[PDB]
Amino acid sequence: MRLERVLEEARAKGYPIEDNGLGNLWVVLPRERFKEEMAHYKAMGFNFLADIVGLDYLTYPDPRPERFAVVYELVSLPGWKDGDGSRFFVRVYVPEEDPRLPTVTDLWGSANFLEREVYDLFGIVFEGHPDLRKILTPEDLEGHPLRKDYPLGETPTLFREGRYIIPAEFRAALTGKDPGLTFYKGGSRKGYRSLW
Amino acid sequence: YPDAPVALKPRFHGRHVLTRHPNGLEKCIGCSLCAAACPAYAIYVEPAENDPENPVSAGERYAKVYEINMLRCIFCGLCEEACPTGAIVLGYDFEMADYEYSDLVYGKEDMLVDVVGTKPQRREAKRTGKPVKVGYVVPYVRPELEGFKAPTEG
Amino acid sequence: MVRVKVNDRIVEVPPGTSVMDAVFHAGYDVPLFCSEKHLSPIGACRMCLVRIGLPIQWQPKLAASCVTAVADGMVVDTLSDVVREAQAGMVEFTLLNHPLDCPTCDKGGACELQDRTVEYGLYEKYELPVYTRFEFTRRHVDKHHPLSPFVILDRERCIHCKRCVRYFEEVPGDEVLDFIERGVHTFIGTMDFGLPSGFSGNITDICPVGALLDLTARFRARNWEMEETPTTCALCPV
Amino acid sequence: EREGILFTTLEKLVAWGRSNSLWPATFGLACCAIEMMASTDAQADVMIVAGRLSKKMAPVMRRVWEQMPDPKWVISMGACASSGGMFNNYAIVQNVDSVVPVDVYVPGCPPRPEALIYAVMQLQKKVRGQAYNERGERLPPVAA
Amino acid sequence: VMTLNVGGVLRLMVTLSGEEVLEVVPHIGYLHTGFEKTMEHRTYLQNITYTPRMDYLHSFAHDLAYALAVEKLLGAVVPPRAETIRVILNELSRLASHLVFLGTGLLDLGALTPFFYAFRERETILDLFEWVTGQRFHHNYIRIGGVKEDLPEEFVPELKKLLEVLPHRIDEYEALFAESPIFYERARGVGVIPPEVAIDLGLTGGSLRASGVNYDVRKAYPYSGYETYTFDVPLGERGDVFDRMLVRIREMRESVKIIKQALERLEPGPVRDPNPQITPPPRHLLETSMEAVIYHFKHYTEGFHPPKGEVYVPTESARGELGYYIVSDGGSMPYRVKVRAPSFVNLQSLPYACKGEQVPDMVAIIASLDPVMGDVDR
Amino acid sequence: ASSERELYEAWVELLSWMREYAQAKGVRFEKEADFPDFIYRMERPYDLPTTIMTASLSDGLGEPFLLADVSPRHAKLKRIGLRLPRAHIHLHAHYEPGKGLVTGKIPLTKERFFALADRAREALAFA
Ligand code: SF4
Ligand code: SF4
Ligand code: SF4
Ligand code: SF4
Ligand code: SF4
Ligand code: FES
Ligand SMILES: [Ca+2]
Ligand SMILES: [Mg+2]
Ligand SMILES: [Mg+2]
Ligand SMILES: [Mg+2]
Asked: E357 with E365: CB under 8 angstroms?
C-alpha cells in the first residue's frame, strides 16, 4: 500500500532494494540524501519509528560499503488514521574515520533514547540530538563496547587445584570468519537453509 | 516453613548427580561434552585411561577429574542434554549455600548417585553425628535418576 | 593461463592446475580425504567428484577433481543434485564400517571425517530422516595399539585415505608403514616395529581421523579445550 | 582478659544474641529480587544481594553497605552476585565480594525461596561462631 | 525551583518548583548486563538461556521472539503440537506478568485480601512451569525446532484447575478497580498520554491501546499461529493510569480465551523438527548410528550454521513490541543480536506523562507503564 | 529366536577359553572394545552377559594373532567372528538348535579352538 509508493520511487532513483526471502526488505540511502528523503517518508504516512539498530561490520567475512551502518525501521500503525501497515528498514553505511550522522529527532520522538544508545555502544554521533549523553554504559567507560574491536573482557572461570578455563580459548563454536579446527570448512558449515 | 518439607516436581533442576549403571561402573566416559555445551564455563573434565583389571567405566576413557563450580552454574540442564551416556543429570538437593567461594566447586565424590546431601549438609552432619535430613519430597524420582535414593513419600 | 569457470564464478589459473585447487581458488568447495598438501594427489577416496563440461558438452561420468588438469574454457559443477547425491553417498560408504567412538576419541572436534560428514552427508532428497542405512556387523579389528613410544594406531578408525604410507615413501623416504591384506579386510601395519624414521610424528597431523595419534599426549584434553600458541621451535637452527 | 573465660563466655552470648536479632535489608536487582519477594511475603544488620551487580551500580551498593550498624553480614544470593554468573563480560562485577565482604554465598538462578532460608539459617550458625569450612577450620563470625 | 533526586532501580532527576513537576530526566543503566554483545559469543542454542533473563516477568516472549527469528533464517518448520504448546506457554507467561502488575496495584489500593490471592494465582502458574520445564523462571524450554521435550501427564489436569477458577477471578479484579472506591480519585485524570503522542514516542505495551490506538502485533503482523484464534484487543478511552490498569486486566481475560482455545486443538505428535541439520538426533539411536553419533557430537560442540543474512520478526509481549534483529555470517554463533526491548522505548513517554502533575502520583504514574529494568537496561 | 540369547551365552564361553589359553600359554589377552550399545544405552535396559564386543590374543609386541567379535544387539545377520590377522583367514560361527556353536557344519569346540590358536601362535607371533 504505502510501501509500494516507496519502492516505486526508490527504484526510479538509484536506491538499492535489499531482500531476504523471509519477509523483511531494506532500502539503502546514501549519506546526504538520507536526512531529506527520510523526512519524505514521514509525510508519506510513516508515523511510528519502531527501532534503530547499530551495526559494526569490521569482522564480517564479505566486504561492505563502509565499516559502520545504522538501520531504521518505519511503520504505519494499523489502528489509527488510515494507516495501512506498511513497514520496512532503511539502512545507511557510515565512514569509520568520520562517525557523524544527522538525527531524526525532528521527525520522531522515539528516536531520542534509541539514537543515544547507538552512540553509547558504537561511536556514532548524531548531528543535533537534544543531548548525546551515554545511556547504558557507566559514566567512566572508556570507548564504545558494542563494536567489534572492543574486548568482551572475560575472567577465567576457576576450579580446584589451579585448574582454570579461559572462555576465549575454550569455545568450540566458530565465528564465520573463523577457519575452523581442521584445514577448511565447507558445505553446511558455510551456511545452511532448508527449503520449507 | 523449614519445618514442613518443600514439595518439588519430578522435573526440578537441582544439584547435579553422576549416575552409575547396574554393573556398578560409572556412566561417565570423560568426554567433556557436557562442559562443551555449557554457557557458563562451569565444568572442568580431566580424562584418564581405564585400567582393564580395575575399570572405572565401560569405555577406554573415564573421568579422572570432574568439577562443577556451582557459583557459576545456572542450572539449565543443557549439560544433561549434551551427555551421550545419561551420566550428569540435575537432581533434587537445593539446600546448599556455604561460606568460602572455592568450597562451592563440587567434585566427583560430591555428586555420585550414592551420596545423600550437599557439601554443607554432610559437613555439618559430620561434626554432629546426626544423620542428614533433606528438606524436601517428591512424587517420584525420574526415570533418568535411576538409583538416586530420595525422600519421596509423595 | 587457463580460463576456468567453476560454479558461476570464472577464474584464471596456470595450466598445471588441479580441478580441485581450481574449485577452491574460486571460492566453492568439496569433500576431501585422501588428498593432501605436498603429497602426491590420487583419486582414492573418491569424494572430490565433480561434474565437467568442455563445450555445453557435459562428460558422462563424474571426475575426481584432485587428479584432473584444467582444460581451457572448462566448466565445473559442484552444486547439482547429481553431485550432492554422490557426495552424501561417499560419506555414507565411509561411515559404513566406522567404529562409533567419537566422544571417547582423541580426534576431538579436529576430525576431518566428523566434519565433512556433517558438511555433505545426509542428502536432502525432494517423513522421518534416515541416519544410517547400513545395519550389519561393523569392521571389528585391532584397536588402541602403540606403534612406538610416541604413536598409537587405531585400525578400526582408519578410512584408508592413502596419506601415511604415501607420506613415508615420498617425504622422509622411510617405508615403515603400508597396507596389508586386500579388499575389505585391509589394514595399516608395520614390520619395522620401532617406527624407525626420525619424522614419524608427522603422520599424526596428516591422518584425517583418529587412527594415528600422538601418544605423548593421549587423553589430556579435547581439541577445542587447548590453548593454542603459535610460535617457533628453538631446538636447532632451522 | 581479651581471651579469658570471662570476656570469652560473654561475647559467646552477645553473638548468640544478635544471632536471633537479625534484621535483613534486601538489596534486589533483577530476577532474584522477584524470587525473594516470595520469601519475605511468607536500622538493619545483614544485607542480601540478589542479582546482577552492574559496574555502574557497584559504587552505590558500597555506600549503602558502609553506612550501616557495625555488626553486619552480607548474603550473596544467586549466581550473578556470587560470581559473574553466566555474564562473564565488561558490564558486570564478577563476584559482589569484589566490593563488599560476603559471609554466605547461595547458589541457584534464582535460588528457590526456601534456599534463601537455608542461606540465612547458615548465616546464623556463622554469627554464632559455630560454622566451619571444608578445610575443617572455624569461621570468624563477621567479615571484617 | 528545587531539583530533587529520587532513586525502584531507576534513578530519576526531577527538576521541580513547588509541588508540580517541571521535568523528569531518568538515568538508567544500573541493570545493564550487556546481553547484546555477550550473545555474539555463544551458540544459537546457548543464546536461548539469555533471552529469558531480560524480561524475567514475561520471559517466554523473549524465548519466542528469538527462536521465531532463527527459525526464519535456517528454514526450520515447527510441528503443529509445538506451535500449540508455545502459545499455551506464551500467554501463561503473560498472565504471570500481568498478575504482577496487578498485584502491585492491589497494594496501592489497600486491598490485602484480593492481593494475597493474586500472589497464589501466580504461584500456581509458576508451579505449572516447574512441572514441564523444571524451572520457575528462565525455563530452558523453547528450542529452534519446537520445544526441548514433550510435556508431563500432570500438566493438562493442572492447567484445567487454573482454567476453571480464573474466568470469574479475573472479573472480580475488573470490578474492584472498575467499581472504583478510592481508585477513581487517584487515577482518573493522571498520566495524560494523548493518542497522537504515544504513536510518536513509540509507546506500545497496551499503554498504547489504553490511549485509543488499535495496534496489537498478534493481529497486525501475526506470528505463532495466532492468525487462527479468537481475539478482542482491549481498548481504552483517554490514556491514563486508570484506563491503563483496566486494559491489562481486560487483557488477562483474552489470554485465557487463548489458553482454552488452544488446549482444545492440542493433539499428539512430534514436538520438534526432525531435520538432522537443525536438531540433534533421537538419543535412543545414539547406540547404533555412526551418522547419529557424529551429528550429536558436532551439534552440541560447534553449533549449526545459519546462512549469511539479516532478519527481524516482530512479536508482542505483556509490555509492547518485542523482537530480535539477528545478523548471521554463517557461524556457530550470531554476528549481531540487537534486541528491541519494549520497556526501553516505553520509557521516553515518562518525562511527558507526569509533566506538571502532582508528586506522590508520580509513583503510580510510572507503575502504569509496566517497565522491567532488565528489559530497558539489558 | 531365543538363539540370539544363546549366541551370547556362547560368546562369553569363547571369551573364557581365550582367557584360559592366555594365562596357560602365558600370552596377552586383550579387551579390544566394549559394545557401543552399552556405553550409550542411557536409561535403556541391558541384559547381555557381558560388555565386550572385540576381544584378542596379542603377543609380546601387542600385535594380535587372533581376533574375536560378536554382532551388537541391535544388528542384523548375527554371527561371532574368528580372524587370524596377517594370514587372511576369516571364520563365521553361528548357533544351531540342539547342536551347538557351529562353523557351517563343524562343531566349534574348546578342543578345535585351542588348535587354531596354537597353530596361530607358533606361526604368526612376531615376538
Ligand atoms: S546446568 Fe547449565 S550452567 Fe550448570 S553445568 Fe549444566 S550446562 Fe553449565
Ligand atoms: S557429557 Fe556425560 S559422559 Fe561426557 S564427560 Fe560429561 S558427564 Fe561424562
Ligand atoms: S575418527 Fe572422527 S569419526 Fe571416527 S570416532 Fe574419532 S572423531 Fe569420530
Ligand atoms: S591410518 Fe590415517 S593416514 Fe593412514 S591410511 Fe588410515 S586414515 Fe589415512
Ligand atoms: S542469578 Fe539468575 S535469577 Fe538471579 S539475577 Fe542472575 S540471571 Fe536473574
Ligand atoms: S580427494 Fe580426490 S579422490 Fe580423495
Ligand atoms: Ca593390541
Ligand atoms: Mg568516542
Ligand atoms: Mg593397548
Ligand atoms: Mg500531564
From this structure: yes
Cβ–Cβ gap D30/E34 under 8 Å: no
Going from the C-alpha of C1 to that of each of A112, C6, C9, C22, C24, the distances in angstroms are 58, 15, 16, 12, 17
Mutation target for A interface from B34, B38, B44: give the one with most A CBs within 10 A. B44
d(CA A51, CA E349): 15
Which residues of C make up each annotated binding site for [4Fe-4S] cluster? 98, 102, 105, 111, 158, 161, 164, 207, 233, 236
Cβ distance E350 to E373 under 8 Å? Answer: no
CB F27 within 8 A of CB F57: yes
Domain total in chain D: 1
Q: What is the total count of domains within chain A? A: 1
Rounded-to-integer distance, Cα C130 and Cα B121, Å: 49
Q: Answer whether A74's CB lies under 8 Å from A88's CB.
A: yes
What order do you get walking across the sheet with C145-146 strand by strand? C145-146, C151-153, C212-214
Chain B residue at shortest CA distance from E153 = B10
What is the C-alpha separation between B35 and B57, in angstroms, rounded? 19
Half-sphere exposure (Cβ direction) of E118: Cα atoms closer than 13 Å: 26
Alpha-carbon separation of residue C181 from A179, B63, C188 (angstroms): 38, 37, 9
Instruction: Please tell me if residue E327 touches chain A, with a CB cutoff of 8 Å.
Output: yes
Q: For chain F, give every domain's residue range.
A: 1-127
Q: How far is it, in rounded angstroms, from Cα A144 to Cα A56?
A: 11
- Compute the nearest-CA separation of A147 from chain C (Å): 25
Residue D57's nearest CA partner among E33, C3, A184 is E33
Chain C CB contacts of B32 below 8 Å = 221-222, 225
- State which residues form the domain around A75: 1-196
CATH of the domain at E303: 1.10.645.10
Please check whether residue C53 is in contact with residue C75, taking contact to mean a CB–CB distance below 8 angstroms.
yes
What is the structure's resolution, reported in angstroms to one decimal? 3.1
Distance from CA of C53 to the nearest CA of A (A): 22
Check CB contact under 8 Å for F41 and E288: no
Residue A137: list chain D partners with CB under 8 A: 56, 91
Chains contacting E (3+ CB pairs below 8 angstroms): A, B, C, D, F
Range of the domain at D76: 1-144
User: How far is C-alpha C208 from the geometric centre of its chain's CA atoms?
Assistant: 5
* CATH label of the domain that carries residue D116: 3.40.50.12280
Residues 6+ apart with CB under 8 A from E159: E88, E92, E128, E259, E263
Per the structure block, which three cell numbers stand in for C57?
558438452
Q: Work out the number of other CB atoms within 10 angstroms of the CB of residue C57.
A: 8
Assess if CATH 3.30.200.20 describes domain F1-127. Answer: no
DSSP A110: T
Residue A173: how many other CB atoms lie within 10 Å = 20
Around ligand 6, the residues with Cβ closer than 6 Å are C 32-35, 43-48, 64, 66
| Number of separate domains in chain E | 1
Contact E347, E378 (CB under 8 A): no
Is F39 close to B58, i.e. CB distance below 8 A?
yes
Question: In the sheet that A87-94 helps form, which strands lie side by side, from edge to edge?
Answer: A48-56, A68-75, A87-94
- Residue E376: which domain range? 1-378
**Helix/strand/coil percent split, chain B, to 5:** 15, 20, 65
Q: What share of chain D is helix, strand, coil (3-state, %, to 5)?
A: 35, 10, 50
Domains and CATH numbers, chain B: 1-154 (3.30.70.3270)
